[PDB]
Design a protein around this nucleic acid. Structure first.
Length: 41
DNA sequence: CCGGTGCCGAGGCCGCTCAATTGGTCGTAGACAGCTCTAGCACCGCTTAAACGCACGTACGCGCTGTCCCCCGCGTTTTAACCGCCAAGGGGATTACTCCCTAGTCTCCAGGCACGTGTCAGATATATACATCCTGTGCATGTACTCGGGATATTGAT
């Protein structure tokens, strides 16, 4: 829905293997427009 | 006054929902099998020569074998400082994160010393005659163990 509704907003998903998620967290640690994460995460 | 009963609060059950673990498959590349001489070379076959290893007596000590006496071990007692357990304060080693940096890869370069061969000569095995230094034996004596009695600590209980 974000990748199609508007070609402006940038998503930075946060759900997956500890490695990928840690890398994503390190990234912004600014294009972090929107973030997608689960309740448990 | 006490007691039945609704309301609320808590404990018990069950179940996913999700995040972390571990054996299975793909794949490619440097290194275990495996000739191929070769190569000269150790290993084998075939001889003798000398000596050490082996066996038989036989002399001759150093281990087993029998008898008295106390000194050390056994066994008891009480009691006390130590072992073991418990508990609390707090410091520091642990765990996780970001940032820096030098290990690791490989590439290129090149001159120093491992490494082999060739030459030759003097240090070392070896045999024989010479001889004297070390070794078994015998024996005097004195440094050291032992017994006894008087100093100086050296601990424990008021």
């Amino acid at each position: 829905e974000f990748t199609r509704f508007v070609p402006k907003f940038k998503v930075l998903p946060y759900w997956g293997n500890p490695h990928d998620r840690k890398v994503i967290r390190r990234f912004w640690s600014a294009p972090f427009h929107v973030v997608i994460t689960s309740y448990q995460l």
